[PDB]
Fold this protein.
Amino acid sequence: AFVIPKKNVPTSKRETYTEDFIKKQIEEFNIGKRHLANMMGEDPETFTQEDIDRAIAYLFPSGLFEKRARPVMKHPEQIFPRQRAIQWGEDGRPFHYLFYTGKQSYYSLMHDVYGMLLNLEKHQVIGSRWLIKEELEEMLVEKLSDLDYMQFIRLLEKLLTSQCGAAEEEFVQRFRRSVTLESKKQLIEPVQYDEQGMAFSKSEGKRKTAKAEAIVYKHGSGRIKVNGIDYQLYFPITQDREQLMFPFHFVDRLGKHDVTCTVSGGGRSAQAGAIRLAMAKALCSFVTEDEVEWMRQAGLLTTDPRVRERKKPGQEGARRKFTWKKR
Amino acid sequence: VNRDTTAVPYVFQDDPYLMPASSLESRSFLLAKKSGENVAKFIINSYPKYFQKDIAEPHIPCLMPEYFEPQIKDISEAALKERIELRKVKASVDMFDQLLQAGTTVSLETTNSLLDLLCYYGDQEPSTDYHGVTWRAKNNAERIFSLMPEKNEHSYCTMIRGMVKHRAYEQALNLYTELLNNRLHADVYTFNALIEATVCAINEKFEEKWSKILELLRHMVAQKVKPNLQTFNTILKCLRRFHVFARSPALQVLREMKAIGIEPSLATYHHIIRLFDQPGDPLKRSSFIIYDIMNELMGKRFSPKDPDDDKFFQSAMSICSSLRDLELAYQVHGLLKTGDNWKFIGPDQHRNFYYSKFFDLICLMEQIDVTLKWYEDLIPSAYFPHSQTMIHLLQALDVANRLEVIPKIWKDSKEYGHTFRSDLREEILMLMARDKHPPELQVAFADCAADIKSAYESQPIRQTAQDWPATSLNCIAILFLRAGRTQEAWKMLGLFRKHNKIPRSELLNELMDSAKVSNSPSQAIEVVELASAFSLPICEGLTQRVMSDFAINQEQKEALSNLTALT
Amino acid sequence: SFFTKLTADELWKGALAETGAGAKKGRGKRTKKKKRKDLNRGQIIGEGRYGFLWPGLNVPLMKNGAVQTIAQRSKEEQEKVEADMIQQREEWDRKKKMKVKRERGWSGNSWGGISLGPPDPGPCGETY
Amino acid sequence: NHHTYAELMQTLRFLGLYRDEHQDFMDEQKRLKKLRGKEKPKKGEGKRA
Amino acid sequence: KNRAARVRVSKGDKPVTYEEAHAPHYIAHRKGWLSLHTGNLDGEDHAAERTVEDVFLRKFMWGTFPGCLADQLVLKRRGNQLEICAVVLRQLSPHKYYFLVGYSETLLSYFYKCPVRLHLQTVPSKVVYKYL
Amino acid sequence: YLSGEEVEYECYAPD
Amino acid sequence: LGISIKVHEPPRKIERFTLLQSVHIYKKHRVQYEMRTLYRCLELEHLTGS
Amino acid sequence: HYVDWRMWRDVKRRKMAYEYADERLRINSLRKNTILPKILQDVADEEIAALPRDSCPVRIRNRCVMTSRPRGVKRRWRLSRIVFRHLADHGQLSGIQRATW
Amino acid sequence: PLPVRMGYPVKKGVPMAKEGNLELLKIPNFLHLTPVAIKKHCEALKDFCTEWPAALDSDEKCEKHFPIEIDSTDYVSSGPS
RNA sequence: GGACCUGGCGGUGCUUCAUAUCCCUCUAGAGGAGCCUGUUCUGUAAUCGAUAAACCCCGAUCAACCUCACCACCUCUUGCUCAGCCUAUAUACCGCCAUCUUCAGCAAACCCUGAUGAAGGCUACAAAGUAAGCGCAAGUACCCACGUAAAGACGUUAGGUCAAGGUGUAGCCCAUGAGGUGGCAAGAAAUGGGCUACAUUUUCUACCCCAGAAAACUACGAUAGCCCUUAUGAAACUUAAGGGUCGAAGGUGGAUUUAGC
Ligand SMILES: [K+]
Ligand SMILES: [K+]
Ligand SMILES: [K+]
Ligand SMILES: [K+]
Ligand SMILES: [K+]
Ligand SMILES: [K+]
Ligand SMILES: [Mg+2]
Ligand SMILES: [Mg+2]
Ligand SMILES: [Mg+2]
Ligand SMILES: [Mg+2]
Ligand SMILES: [Mg+2]
Ligand SMILES: [Mg+2]
Ligand SMILES: [Mg+2]
Ligand SMILES: [Mg+2]
Ligand SMILES: [Mg+2]
Ligand SMILES: [Mg+2]
Ligand SMILES: [Mg+2]
Ligand SMILES: [Mg+2]
Ligand SMILES: [Mg+2]
Ligand SMILES: [Mg+2]
Ligand SMILES: [Mg+2]
Ligand SMILES: [Mg+2]
Ligand SMILES: [Mg+2]
Ligand SMILES: [Mg+2]
Ligand SMILES: [Mg+2]
Ligand SMILES: [Mg+2]
Ligand SMILES: [Mg+2]
């Protein structure tokens, strides 16, 4: 016997969590759950996971930017990654007849879908999407290739085009994930009333570093006051006044509303832009829903995200680089 | 906030590896920590220049180095006073001699301040970090005193107090005569010491000693000196020798304190408690002395007045155990828990003695449901138990018929340093195996006996031969059978022959019942073979049982015939 | 300066020069090589040149049931301790110098013919 | 005060209470250089005399 | 290539702690600070002095508990209190740890003129986050 | 290679 | 304790500064650091000195 | 025990500048006004020029306290860029992090 | 007595356990300031407090009786000074 | 010498590409002038390092003394240090980085093919590969999920740094160490980067965008030169600011070349 440096694979190996381990981790979580409830003077019976997270954030305050790195006291089911069960018994016989494919769960699904397509022959969008590969890989609890995912989707689509019945429709919906779309419909500000009873709306707008707050009155003669000044005295530049005109002109309401707005920060153009957005948002309270959608599609209700880019070190500007020295 | 019962005292490091697991480690861990502090102070004071940068605001005087050396090198009176404050006995004497030879005048106040230093330490140097009678016959104190030109009352008083402190009782009484011949008046502190010398100077009968003391007290009244607490405390402390003779005289001192206006301290009652607590039947007198002393002390907060105040609670609990009075023990503990009275418990040795006698009295005279509440409140939070209290606790569980707690007492016993105590493991095993129990309990007793077996196998005396008592082996084997772990029990039978320990009759009979259930004739013969080796009388009768009960093969029959030949 | 000092790991990583263009392509050959030595190996916490005896750190805390006090070894008693540590260092070096020499192969510098021992035991408790 | 820090920790090393890994490293390099013949000369007795 | 405080990939046999496994850009994102004091806050003074003290204490504890430290020190300052929190191994006898705690707390209290406490947490072995 | 072949019980409160 | 208290969060301050990345040359390569100071303001009213 | 001889010279310059600060402050006050006679200010000019050269505070250099690097030092921590980064990059400087924005 | 974990987990791993967890040691925890403790602490501190004058109901009433305002600031920092 | 493999290379084939990108296209520049600054060369008794891309307002978020490591002269010798050395070696190194990277690959442990040769290992209606880990990705920071930062493995250039500090080896120890005084750093010239200009979309003033004048030898144009004052300092023809005086080249710049979605 000669001592070739002995090998140890277990060092870098992963730590699999046996089912007995999880069973004892849950006993600790239930005892700790009652301890934590006793610490905070709350009833242990009605102590929820939201209360645990709130109590842990107080007792162990962490400012780490990444939430996953902060203290956590969760149920082991949530913490520990799901573990694939034994795939054979004591006699060594695998449970599933497709074990030796190495992908028994995936190929069993292809077998079940292929079998349904056969029976149909013997017998004979907007709100939903197909699940992604990372969601299929969790239903099956296996690792999948990209082409494996495509083959499964191509086989489901081939099943919808057929005259699939109710039994063949509950199955496909297991792999359709509803896509919840946020509405682009603009939110309308409430219509308020002043001491004199004149209806008005109020909104806010931001352009670069300029911040504006505008009060649009339901009825008026077209007067606009900016920090108490006539708009043409506050904005001597003709382009800044055209920006103030743009919202009212677009909906054919020049000379129909009075506006009193306040703006701070930014330059002359950014201030006119911020007022344009504030007036447009407030003006949406006095127009029809169809007119509000036209203003949205005209770019009058979107906050401009274009702000100055920081300079980086080692270059002259935000993008400009120093001269590449002559070689 | 109250004491945390799951924790060890705050002084220890709150870590499972660093927490003390025994009363021995409780004492030694603190001594190791104090040693580290002393080594730091030794370095701080030896190399003060490294620790002289003061960045603290406000200044912290107690975090600066200490300078124990005199900084005045001139020979004069003002330089001697410095060496007296630093308590330099040799340097101060040398400086005093040189100063005297030169002929310069040394004030009286300073000459006395030099005697106070020599008379207190006995012409010896006080202990430092690193460099019988003790009234040395050749002592600077007596010499300087004789050479002294003018001697005041204070000069004699410090000589009389120093002699008595160092056990020169006879010299101090002789010096007390000169003070009177010189028409001087002593102070109360001198009288306190002379009372100590009157009793300890010579051994005589009580009546002779009690007549001298009353003469010192009357002298103290002639000289217009008022007695203090230590005057009466010294009388009671010195009467401890005479015991029964001093019982009524001692109570006359206490009644005098109350009238005069001096208030008895905890030490005043400690001395009376010890005086009345002589070996014998305490019921005759000690009963009503402790009952009356506690009614007086009920609901009183105490302040330190005498050095012996930290001995009352240890003394009072000692009698409550002797009388076996649990109601009185609660009153003593109640007094210890009022206000800040808990600080008079005493050093670690006195704290462990107090709680041992207190808890051992609870286990004895208190209900088991309350006993286990004190067990949780006191151990290890207040003290670590001695192995004899674990036994007193098991005896309390036995008397209450609550034996499901035995496995917990063993688990705790290990955590307190009693894993390898023989008297304890024998006690646990005997109680567990004394009688049969339901299957659920019997299984638990077999898991504990297994852990005990491991303790016997992995003793630290494993370097030497392993000592397996006979009772321990019999009990551990019986517990395995009754639990159904017959395989483990059969294996252990070898250890009876290896260590030559007699098997118990009950163990042999239960082994047969495990064989007849398994219908194994060889094992049944193995039992008869074991009892035959020791020549037990039950064997010859057991062989008859084996014949009928089990089918005997010709080889087995000859084997029994071989044992029959031995018969 | 105390603050310019580094740890032993930093000092050995630098001194050994195992990472570098020399060690990348074996551009440097090593007939003479700096060998790493653990200098904390035979060192006892609490033991210094002055020979102080710290109770509870390098000597027992209690002696004859009483707590020991700070003490210092005599000049003669300390030389023996120092000498004993030097001999223990050469003895340890002698233990490393004593390595059992293995049989050679077809020739002294040849690998051919040398035994490598039995193959490693397989994962399923297989042995060879 | 670099004197205080260096002098304090040097003293603590001689007392056995501080292990200076850097100093130990230097002491081993200096020890092995004597065995190699590369010892520091006596002041005034340098290679040039 | 960036080098600062990066344990480089090896053969999968090098155990690294959580702190050692995170490069500097993860500071304040995945790993916290090893010392907490007020000197680096806006409008606060004496950052230079707190920094020198911290560098010393790390060297002092490394050499005072040689071979015992299983992770970097966590230094906490509240008022004038200095708390040193160390993760140590379970090889030295408890007596030697109590000696060094008493010794270190006292020596550091007189050196920096402030009450110093040392808190020891023992682990059986260096806690391994991953094998690089 | 040829020159040289290259070169439990835990209890509480131990004394 | 019966004290009237209001709370608000003043705006945070981030102090940034730049340092060279290399020990020697390579000027155009820098490392940038920041110190973030966050604020909370407790405003108590109508309380005695005790 | 200072890092180098150059740090040791700056230590002495800082100690001597501290000892002469009051003397130099008082003499400079006589030179920094148009009230006193020139005959008196000319004598004060000679007096401050006769003080030791290393008493002048303009000769003090802010060197790295751990490496004595004379440039690239951050005054707030008194450390060179290299030493500061070493401590900052190991999370040993309270509240300091890499800046991304 | 809490099974609290902290640390960014490795792939298919879990946040590190509390034993030997330096990230939890770095946190200024509030275990000594639980709501139960704070309420008990403040019950003991009520004996130290005094009652604001009821007559001074509004700031305008304070200004009438106490026209002078004195502002001073105390600074709490960590360190020896 | 034969055959074959790998690499390198080809004034080597074909194919598809680069998105501020190789060419053209778009905008503002550099290349010409003065000035500022770096380097080279020359000069000087008088540092060093960087020095194709990936050096050249680079180590320096910075040199009148100091800094300083250089030169000349003088002085000290167990020396601020249980010495010291900015002495040699970055081709011994740690530490921290450049570079491809404006990449996506590296890879332990196994398995199989080639007769068990150097070698090779992919086809999805799939034919021998499985792969921990690392990187990318994800996540986080900044104002979003966008963008910008940050991140960016292994390897390439014995790439940069012994003068950040530390340190292997070699060398110095009345000197290659330490201190003091004074001094060097100029420009025949060449060149890189930048600033200011050559003007009318300009110049001056008011104003901060509805004005009045200026507008070619008293215009535009020096942040230069010269003189004075002030600021900092112990020290200023020297550094900085301001004023005065002066009013030059320059009239929008060849080959070539830089940056930006
Ligand atoms: K080729
Ligand atoms: K040009
Ligand atoms: K390198
Ligand atoms: K170096
Ligand atoms: K070197
Ligand atoms: K140019
Ligand atoms: Mg630009
Ligand atoms: Mg040979
Ligand atoms: Mg980079
Ligand atoms: Mg300067
Ligand atoms: Mg040009
Ligand atoms: Mg040069
Ligand atoms: Mg060069
Ligand atoms: Mg070079
Ligand atoms: Mg190059
Ligand atoms: Mg000079
Ligand atoms: Mg100079
Ligand atoms: Mg030199
Ligand atoms: Mg290199
Ligand atoms: Mg993004
Ligand atoms: Mg980047
Ligand atoms: Mg990334
Ligand atoms: Mg090179
Ligand atoms: Mg020299
Ligand atoms: Mg000018
Ligand atoms: Mg001046
Ligand atoms: Mg002109």
Notes: Chains G and B do not touch (no CB pair under 8 Å).
